[PDB]
Amino acid sequence: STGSATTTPIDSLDDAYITPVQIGTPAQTLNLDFDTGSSDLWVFSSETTASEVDGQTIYTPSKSTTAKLLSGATWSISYGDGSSSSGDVYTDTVSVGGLTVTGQAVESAKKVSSSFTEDSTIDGLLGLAFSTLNTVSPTQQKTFFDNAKASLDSPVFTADLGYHAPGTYNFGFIDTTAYTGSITYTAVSTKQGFWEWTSTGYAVGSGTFKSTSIDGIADTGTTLLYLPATVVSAYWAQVSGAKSSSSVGGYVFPCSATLPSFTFGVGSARIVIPGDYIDFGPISTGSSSCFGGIQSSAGIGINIFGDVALKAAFVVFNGATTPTLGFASK
Ligand SMILES: CC[C@H](C)[C@H](NC(=O)C[C@H](O)[C@H](CC1CCCCC1)NC(=O)CCNC(=O)[C@H](Cc1ccccc1)NC(=O)N1CCC(N)CC1)C(=O)NCc1cnc(C)nc1N
């Protein structure tokens, strides 16, 4: 079996992408953020504190006939930017663009951090990392992809994010009409529970390619691209006026400057990110200073290939026994 769903940017900056998901019987459609950097499927619901919901669509367990409370199970997660959510657990039917999985763990939020409440376009998350990161206690639960793996024509899923436009999430097959040239596969380390791989190097603009190993994770749930201090400093040095701002918390540049492209290595292949992709707008309404899409990871503890890098490629997440990552131009 297979499934295909359209993913849409939440705002004109591509800060995040939402995908419609059918939950329960009869279906209750919620727009979730697909996150390959987490392994929990949580949603706003009729249980969430009333004061913590501001326009999001909620899931109503009592309205679903397939819904069933997972007695004693609880969840609690906190993300890299500090956001947090927690609540109880249910099992129910979940369909993503045709692909149906019964008995999927649906984590119902009882508490959500203020950053979530302020975000009316995101109804919840669908984690696509490795099941080892699931926070359901005391009985860990499997992810949606893990649950469908056995029924898919191919234990894979693909990410095709668009720049200032809609994209596609496919489950169980490769659309050979969606990319150009060949697909380059690279080893994945599942040790930390992430889609962790190693880039082979980089280039700034038309500069010479630098051979250097960069260890990072493929995370659709992260907006920007976070690389080592040395790499990031070399990029912004090619932009007149750019500088690291203490007050803003990152690299900023004059809104009128042209950004050079950024190249990252996949094996012997190279993926090119257009400079337009790296512009994230005025730091503040009306400002002539703009925020950069490539920032330092010196503080994170790991490099992150977020949407900024991913949307420049057709990405294959091969969940075989020996998982791999596939990158192609498009
Ligand atoms: C089981 C935890 C799980 C693995 C967890 N995983 C993650 O945090 C990675 C995951 O991909 C999450 C998923 C996000 C979380 C926030 C809401 C949207 C989804 N990603 C991040 O945290 C990346 C940092 N945040 C982001 O990149 C958000 C994403 C966003 C976009 C639109 C609207 C709202 C949020 N955007 C931005 O920060 N920016 C974009 C806008 C730009 N103008 C400002 C910068 C984790 O590592 N948590 C850290 C953690 C906490 N506590 C402990 C004890 N250990 C930990 N490792």
* 3-state SS class at 88: strand
SS3 category, 34? strand
Q: How far apart are the C-alpha atoms of 328 and 181, rounded to whole Å?
A: 7
Instruction: Evaluate whether 5-174 and 175-330 have a shared fold.
Output: yes
The DSSP line for 270-326 is: EEEEPGGGGEEEESSTT-SEEEESEEE-TTTSSEEE-HHHHTTSEEEEE-SSS-EEE
- Ligand 1 nearest-atom number relative to CA 223: 27
Give residue 134's identity as a one-letter amino acid code: N
Ligand 1, atom 45, lies closest to the CA of 223
CB of 116 closer than 8 Å to CB of 50: no
Integer Cα distance of 186 and 296 in angstroms? 24
* CB distance 327 to ligand 1 below 6 Å: no
Give the rounded distance of the alpha carbon of 258 from its chain centre.
27
E strand or H helix at 23, and its extent? strand 17-23
135 lines ligand 1 (CB under 6 A): yes
For domain 175-330, give its CATH number from 1.20.1740.10, 3.20.20.10, 3.40.50.150, 2.40.70.10.
Answer: 2.40.70.10
300, 80 Cβ separation under 8 angstroms: yes
Give the Cα separation of 313 and 242 in Å (integer).
27
Ligand 1 and 16: CB distance under 6 A: yes
Q: How many CA atoms lie within 13 A of 112 on its CB side?
A: 29
Q: How far is the CA of 79 from the centre of ligand 1 (A)?
A: 5
Measured in angstroms, how far is the CA atom of residue 222 from the centroid of ligand 1? Answer: 6
Residue 282 beta carbon below 6 angstroms from any ligand 1 atom? no
Q: Distance between CA 49 and CA 47 in Å, rounded? A: 6
99-127 residues labelled b (16+ CB within 10 A) or e (exposed): bebeebbbbbbbebbeebbebebbbbbbb
Q: C-alpha distances in angstroms, 258 versus 204, 254, 282? A: 13, 9, 14
- Separation of 97 CA from ligand 1 center, angstroms? 25
Whole-angstrom distance, CA of residue 294 vs CA of residue 232 = 7
For domain 5-174, say whether CATH 2.40.70.10 is its number: yes
Half-sphere exposure of 81 (CA within 13 A, CB side): 11
Which residue among 38, 64, 199, 297 is the active-site one?
199
**The pair of three-digit structure tokens given for residue 40, joined into one six-digit string:** 């929990």
Q: What is the resolution of this structure in A?
A: 2.0
Supply φ then ψ for residue 246, to 5 degrees: -70, -40
Cis peptide before 26 (omega within 30 of 0): yes
Q: Please give the C-alpha separations between residue 66 and each of 44, 53, 252, 260, 313, in angstroms, as whole numbers.
A: 18, 25, 50, 52, 38
For tokens 């459609």, what's the residue? 29
Q: In 3D, which of 287, 312, 327, 300 has the Cα closest to residue 232?
A: 300
Q: Could you tell me how many residues make up the chain?
A: 330
d(CA 110, CA 105): 15
DSSP string covering 101-123: EEEEEEEEEEEE-HHHHT-TT--
Nearest-Å Rg of the Cα atoms of the chain is 20
From ligand 1's centre to the CA of 122, what distance in Å? 14
Between CA 41 and CA 9 the distance in angstroms is 20
**302-317 burial, b for 16+ CB within 10 Å, e for fewer?**
ebbbbbbbbbbbbbbb
To which residue do tokens 């436009």 refer?
A: 165
The tokens for 151 are 């029924």
Way it was determined: X-ray
Told to judge if 15 belongs to the known catalytic residues of this protein, a careful annotator would answer no
Is 181 in a helix, a strand, or coil?
Answer: strand
Both structure tokens of 122: 């995101």
Catalytic residue at 199?
yes
Q: How many CB atoms lie within 10 A of CB 170?
A: 20
User: Are the beta carbons of 200 and 267 closer than 8 angstroms?
Assistant: yes
Structure-block tokens of residue 26: 């009869």
Distance (Å, whole) CA 284 – CA 301: 28
The alpha-helical segments, DSSP class H, found in the chain are 114-117, 144-148, 229-236, 307-310
Domain ranges of the chain: 5-174, 175-330
Beta bridge partners of 42: 107, 125
Residue 299, Cβ density class (10 Å: 0-12 exposed, 13-18 middle, ≥19 buried)? exposed
Residues 6+ apart with CB under 8 A from 249: none
* Most informative mutation of 13, 222, 317 for ligand 1 (most atoms within 8 A of CB): 222
Task: Tell me, using a 6 A CB cutoff, whether residue 119 lines ligand 1.
Answer: yes
Give the type of residue at 276: D
Residue 134: CB within 6 Å of ligand 1? no
Whose structure tokens read 């500090």? 82
Q: Ligand 1 pocket: which of 38, 42, 311 to mutate (most atoms <8 Å of CB)? A: 38
The catalytic position among 33, 35, 40, 92 is 35
Whether 196 lines ligand 1, by a CB cut-off of 6 Å, is: no
